């Protein structure tokens, strides 16, 4: 439901083929928040419960509203936490295909983490979905150092965080349909394009 620590809890001797690392939005609960459980259930339907590990970014990522105003749209401590989870996935399960996602501050966190990641681990992330991407205008709809064909951004018309503001208006809270359908569809397509483990 809102807390999933499948990578931290998982046995290295029985690695999943696909590991999904997700960062929630500001003030959201657990480590998956409101959109992460919907994506997780559809990934489990596609790959099976034993085939995919879902891992939320918890620990030092507090998802504090005020940190949206920091230079990279989140805190340095939060970036260190998500970088550490990508490094743990790479170490624990070197043949797993990775996929990533984030909502709002969590989408800025996923973009900052992927930009800073060692290239050999970044290149294993077959697809990344970003909802309400707070650095959408600034980064021109891209994640630095990461290919456009592996990125999908969901930015609603009238969600002001997609157009360079930090104001929260009603379209920012309307990504439920996307998390239920097109975002898992994109992630499953990008994993099957390369394959699994």
Swiss-Prot record:
The 2 disulfide bonds play a critical role in holding the catalytic residues in juxta-position; reduction of the disulfide bridges results in the complete inactivation of the enzyme. It catalyses: cutin + H2O = cutin monomers. The record marks 26, 105 as: Transition state stabilizer. Optimum temperature is below 30 degrees Celsius. Optimum temperature is 30-40 degrees Celsius. Changing residue 168 to A: Increases activity on p-nitrophenyl butyrate and poly(ethylene terephthalate) (PET). It is an enzyme of class 3 (hydrolase). Keywords: Disulfide bond, Glycoprotein, Hydrolase, Secreted, Serine esterase, Signal, Virulence. Disulfide bonds join 15-93, 155-162. It comes from the Eukaryota. Inhibited by n-undecyl phosphonate (C11Y4). Inhibited by paraoxon. Optimum pH is 8. The keyword Glycoprotein applies. The active site is at 104 (nucleophile), 159, 172 (proton donor/acceptor). May have promising applications in chemical and textile industries as it is capable of hydrolyzing a variety of substrates including soluble esters and insoluble triglycerides. Can hydrolyze and thus modulate the surface properties of synthetic fibers such as the plastic poly(ethylene terephthalate) (PET), or the textile fibers polyamide 6,6, polyester and acrylic. SUPFAM superfamilies: alpha/beta-Hydrolases (SSF53474). Belongs to the cutinase family. Catalyzes the hydrolysis of complex carboxylic polyesters found in the cell wall of plants. Degrades cutin, a macromolecule that forms the structure of the plant cuticle. Allows pathogenic fungi to penetrate through the cuticular barrier into the host plant during the initial stage of fungal infection. This is Cutinase 1. It comes from Fusarium vanettenii (Neocosmospora pisi). The lineage of its organism: Eukaryota, Fungi, Dikarya, Ascomycota, Pezizomycotina. The gene is CUT1.
């Amino acid at each position: 439901r809102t807390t999933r620590d499948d990578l931290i809890n998982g046995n290295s001797a029985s690695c999943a083929d696909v590991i999904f690392i997700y960062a929630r939005g500001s003030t959201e609960t657990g480590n998956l928040g409101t959109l992460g459980p919907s994506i997780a259930s559809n990934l489990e339907s596609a790959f099976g419960k034993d085939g995919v590990w879902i891992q939320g970014v918890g620990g030092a990522y507090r998802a504090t509203l005020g940190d949206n105003a920091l230079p990279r749209g989140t805190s340095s401590a939060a970036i260190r936490e998500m970088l550490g989870l990508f490094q743990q996935a790479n170490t624990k399960c070197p043949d797993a295909t990775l996929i990533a996602g984030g909502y709002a501050q969590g989408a800025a966190l996923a973009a900052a983490s992927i930009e800073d990641l060692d290239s050999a681990i970044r290149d294993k992330i077959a697809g990344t979905v970003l909802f309400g991407y707070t650095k959408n205008l600034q980064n021109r709809g891209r994640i630095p150092n990461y290919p456009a064909d592996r990125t999908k951004v969901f930015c609603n018309t009238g969600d002001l965080v997609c157009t360079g503001s930090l104001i929260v208006a009603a379209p920012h809270l309307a990504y439920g349909p996307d998390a239920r359908g097109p975002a898992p569809e994109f992630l499953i397509e990008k994993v099957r394009a390369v394959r699994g483990s």
